[PDB]
From Swiss-Prot:
Chain positions found as Phosphoserine: S81, S92
Protein name, entry field: YTH domain-containing protein 1
Outcome (variant: R132A): Reduced binding affinity for N6-methyladenosine (m6A)-containing RNAs by 100-fold
Result, substituting W34D: Abolishes RNA-binding and ability to influence alternative splice site selection
Subunit structure: Interacts with SRSF1. Interacts with SRSF2. Interacts with SRSF3. Interacts with SRSF7. Interacts with SRSF10. Interacts with CPSF6. Interacts with KHDRBS1/SAM68. Interacts with TRA2B. Interacts with KHDRBS3. Interacts with EMD. Interacts with RBMX. Interacts with ZCCHC8.
Intracellular or extracellular location(s): Nucleus; Nucleus speckle
Resulting phenotype, G68I: Abolishes RNA-binding and ability to influence alternative splice site selection
Range of the intact protein held here: 345 to 508 of 727
Phenotypic consequence of L56E: Does not affect ability to influence alternative splice site selection
Higher taxonomy: Eukaryota, Metazoa, Chordata, Craniata, Vertebrata
Length: 165
């Protein structure tokens, strides 16, 4: 193991991403990308410049689980390869902001039952599973949440560490 993981998470910022469906998380995992609404895009871009790592922790709504976590490798950009997201009913692709590149750190799931002892000070100390899309997770809570995930032995954090700057 957990030492490189702890190194990547040191002084990181953490954001809860609430996905409407599994398809979008599958796309994010396959293509290494995420796109969010402008209100959250602006926050993530600010955070990316502010901290050595910005971690997105994903949860599919109504799944009762987190599906993994990833580190931003870029601010958002426009004009790249299109992504055929399955958007919420009533939302068009033009309503999204730009695309963030992300490097997955863990593609394994974690059930909410395992995080019940973790509360988020930045959301009224409610259990960390509770939060709107884009809710920031305070450092200690976010670190402990990430350390609860099963180790993902398919991941080598060597290349992620070299991106930290
Ligand atoms: C791929 N991004 C999706 S589906 C989304 C929708 C609404 C808010 N944030 C993100």
């Amino acid at each position: 193991g957990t030492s490189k993981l702890k190194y990547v998470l040191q002084d990181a910022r953490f954001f809860l991403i609430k996905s409407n469906n599994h398809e979008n998380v599958s796309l994010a995992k396959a293509k290494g990308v995420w796109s969010t609404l402008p209100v959250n895009e602006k926050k993530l871009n600010l955070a990316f410049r502010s901290a050595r790592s910005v971690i997105l922790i994903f949860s599919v709504r109504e799944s009762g689980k987190f599906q993994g976590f990833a580190r931003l490798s870029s601010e958002s950009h426009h004009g790249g390869s299109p992504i055929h997201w399955v958007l919420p009913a009533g939302m068009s692709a033009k309503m999204l902001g730009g695309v963030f590149k992300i490097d997955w750190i863990c593609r394994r799931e974690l059930p909410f039952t395992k995080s019940a002892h973790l509360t988020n000070p930045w959301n009224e100390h409610k259990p960390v599973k509770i939060g709107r899309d884009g809710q920031e997770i305070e450092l200690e809570c976010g670190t402990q949440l990430c350390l609860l995930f099963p180790p993902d032995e398919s991941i080598d954090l060597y290349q992620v560490i070299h991106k930290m700057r």
